[PDB]
Amino acid sequence: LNHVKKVDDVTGEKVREAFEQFLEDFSVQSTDTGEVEKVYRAQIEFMKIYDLNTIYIDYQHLSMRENGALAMAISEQYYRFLPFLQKGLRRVVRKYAPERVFQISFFNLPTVHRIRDIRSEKIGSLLSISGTVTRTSEVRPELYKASFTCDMCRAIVDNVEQSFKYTEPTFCPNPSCENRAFWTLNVTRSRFLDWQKVRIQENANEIPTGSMPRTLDVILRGDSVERAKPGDRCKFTGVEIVVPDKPSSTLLTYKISFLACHVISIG
Amino acid sequence: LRIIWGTNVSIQECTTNFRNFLMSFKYKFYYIKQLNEMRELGTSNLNLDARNLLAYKQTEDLYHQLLNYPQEVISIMDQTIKDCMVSLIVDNNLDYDLDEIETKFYKVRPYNVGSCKGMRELNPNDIDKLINLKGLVLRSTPVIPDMKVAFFKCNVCDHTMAVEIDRGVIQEPARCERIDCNEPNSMSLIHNRCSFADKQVIKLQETPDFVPDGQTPHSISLCVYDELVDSCRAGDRIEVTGTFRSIPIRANSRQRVLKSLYKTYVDVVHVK
Amino acid sequence: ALPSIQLPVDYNNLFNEITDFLVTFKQDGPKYMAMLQKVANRELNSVIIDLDDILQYQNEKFLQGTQADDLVSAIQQNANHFTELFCRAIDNNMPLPTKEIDYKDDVLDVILNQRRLRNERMLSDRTNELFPPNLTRRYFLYFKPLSQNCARRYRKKAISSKPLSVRQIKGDFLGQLITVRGIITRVSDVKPAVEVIAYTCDQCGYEVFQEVNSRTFTPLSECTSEECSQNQTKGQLFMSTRASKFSAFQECKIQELSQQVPVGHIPRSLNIHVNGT
């Protein structure tokens, strides 16, 4: 049974090679004494001194190449466009460096937004927010991809299953294993990462007494995990999105889930 | 006249019968200058007044027709005044650079139509009507994400096709788009990617200044949308307006069965 | 499988007695002919049917023959069916015009007006099994007690009558219309409940009416309408909240008098529902 045909990403792919250029083609301000060359090549090959599987880039600098118009499509449509930024970077560093899962972080964002400022438009978009920690919870692994199979009786199919449930594998296997069936969960081949849930509280100085500040969770996915300390206010990356527990999918209930691919302790 | 259901309020009349409503002080016992100040600011959100169509004619009855069926007339009104804001554009011709401010949406905020007393007096006989209400804001519920256009995929092909959520419901095709493929493959709904808008909820006491004496005041159930979300902080008796809404709830738990008594809240059109 | 046994109780003729009970009478024109109208005239909602005149009417139905079967005792011995039968015949002799109905005016009055006008007109195209009688009412039915000084006719024992304590309340009192006295406590706030409750359909429309029976029910969608059904694939359908009717409901517990009670024995409060006017 042939697979035809894959699609597409279109603009997302245009932004793939365009952001590929930007991540490769500087991304630099000052010639000579700068702040030149690339600085990201210096940074990624210095990141190959380490291979911690993470990067730092400025959004402000991301403006300059397209005057920020690409920064837009990566601004609101970001969640949609992530898978390309990474493998595009990977395509680029495949020209440079080699057991690899790369993690993006964007900082120096245009403006700090409030929790009261939190709205549905921000979904799949980068945003800067800061405030006080509540209850850091112990770190427990992120599935990313897993190996689970068979699936009746050994399909050994290992990849993907990265959906947010996170169950399950066993989807459309082997051939011919015909699962259904058990996944069956294969844990050992699965690469894991992070993560801890830290609920941020809205800061007192800004909040308008009487208020009782209404606050939600910041999840720490990325090596930026754990860097926080209770009581501090910290710049965050937006990624509004949503979480499962009003609508239902007829063959539910949802709420705000704040994530950051990047965090700094400032504040 | 475009007769509609039992609401039976004529389209392409109210729009027109509101269209001559333009330019009246009058009387009173603004008007178009509010419509006028609106456009430079581009804030949208018509504030209105109400009473308007009361008592001035035309539409002395339409003032009632909105009270009777607000869900409809608000749709018509916003729709009309979008075009009336377009109609003011033809005098100055090219405006605001240009037709995009005509693309920018508008909405009416009717308030102070009659005064109905408390949640206490509220009745089943009227399940749709606008109500003057009071009481202090208790708490602001967390921001509720809301479903507008649901996004879908499959492993077939994999493809990106998405459809409107419409009423609170979700119906995707079991299969399939693109191409074609078809194929038995189940639809892949991305939870996150789909379109969303802001809704909230607030619980509110009924006129804590007033009591049926001695019994405790009943609780106002309010929700709102857009700007009205995070409107004011709380502890505000002040005033509230909106049409009534009620919905049955599932019970035990899960099970997909009704509780056979409708949970009752307010569509909360406006507050001043 | 479900054994079945004859009993002297028969609803058949009692229905007829109810027809002759209402609109035909004198002592209190009669109260049942134009007040019923005043309900259909929309100046009143509650239909107050006194056990008093059930007694006085049996004074017209016995003494004063010809003799008639028992009523107030048959009433307070059952208490529930007499609102589904005694009231169901009221549809028959209710005045038509009635006076000055208008339409809108009242919200949803035009809805039901055009409900059955679009129903008969969409039924007129198909003809060129009906909305249940409980759907169009706009009147509640309230029985009132006979203490009574004229209960001394007498039927003697059959009068309760007495505002007995909940301790006095018994298991054989299920399905029995009675007087109880006691203090109001906690008095749940008034809330709408439900009655039929027409949910619209999506492709060719029509409608179906799910009866509101008991305290809960299963919701339903599929498609019932033959046209949206089987072609194609099935007409979707959702609830129309303005097609719904809600009877008024406020439930309140009533505690014992505390001097009705034996000396020990903590007060026993009982559960009550409110319906209507």
Next chain:
DNA sequence: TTTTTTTTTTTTTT
């Protein structure tokens, strides 16, 4: 085939 639960007693504590 699953259902559904906060006072009262005692305690250690500024």
